[model samples]
Target chain A: GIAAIKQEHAAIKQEIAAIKQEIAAIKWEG
Target chain B: GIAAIKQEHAAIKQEIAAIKQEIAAIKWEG
Candidate 1:
């Protein structure tokens, strides 16, 4: 259970990183 | 249903094109 929670948290962070990169691209590309 | 399918297909193509540029840069950079 604890390991699963950590894995889920990692997934969330990964998604956030991806979104940040996307926003950065649009911000600069625009 | 036809419109929805066409819209989804266009979206998929756009994403593929966007990511292709990103991947091309990284693949050639290193």
Candidate 2:
């Protein structure tokens, strides 16, 4: 059971982290 | 298999109850 998502799933995890970074960059730059 | 496609994944670190509640809010308000 994937009770929770794992960091090893780089595709989704990186996509998610990129989203977070995008938001942070937006806050800083926009 | 992603049997639980409740909402597009959002990386949140908070109360699970609040997360579910906010997802409901986003659904209703969006």
Candidate 3:
């Protein structure tokens, strides 16, 4: 269903954002 | 469609992998 797809897409987007933040912090720390 | 979702997911995965590599390089450089 499109709804499920949208939900998954949103979740992945959120995960990517969180990981980006993690990576950004690591870069700043180093 | 499921195909489009899969394609986007793969693309995002690739981006995440690329970013991880970038972070790794920065850490090594630091």
Candidate 4:
């Protein structure tokens, strides 16, 4: 399932942002 | 999953001509 943006969860949003940054770092390193 | 969307985003990081060139043009024509 395509994950929709979570409006009710600020912590979740922050977590997703961190994950996105981590993914970017991995992509760059790989 | 293949939504003709490139690099994981339907809205990707294309803000310049270099990025546009890297991408196979399906939307903006030159």
Quantify all predictions' global Cα lDDT against the true fold.
0.61, 0.48, 0.84, 0.43
Q: Mind sharing the TM-score for model 3?
A: 0.67
Q: Can you write out model 3's per-residue Cα lDDT over A1-30, one digit (the tens) per residue?
A: 878887988898888889888877876876
TM-score of chain A of each: 0.88, 0.54, 0.87, 0.65
Residue by residue across B1-30, what tens digits does model 4's lDDT show? 335324333333333333345344433547
lDDT of 3 by residue, B1-30 (tens): 878888888988898899878877976875
- Shift of residue A1 alpha carbon in model 4, Å: 27
With candidate 4 superimposed using the best TM-score fit, by how many Å does residue B6's alpha carbon deviate from the native?
A: 28
Least accurate 10 contiguous residues by lDDT in model 2 chain A: A1-10
Model 1, span B1-30: residue lDDT tens: 655655655665566567757755754676
Stretches off by above 4 angstroms in model 2 are A1-8, B1-30
Highest lDDT among the candidates is held by which one? 3
lDDT of 2 at B1: 39
Give the range of the ten consecutive residues with the poorest summed lDDT in model 3 chain B: B21-30
Clashes of 3: 0
What value does the lDDT take at residue B1 in candidate 1?
A: 60
Q: What is chain B's TM-score across the candidates, in the order shown? A: 0.76, 0.45, 0.88, 0.27
| Candidate number achieving the greatest DockQ relative to the actual structure | 3
Per-candidate iRMS values, in order, are 12.1, 8.4, 1.8, 11.8
| Candidate 1 docking class | incorrect
Per-residue lDDT tens digits for candidate 1, residues A1-30, read 556555655655665577567757766875
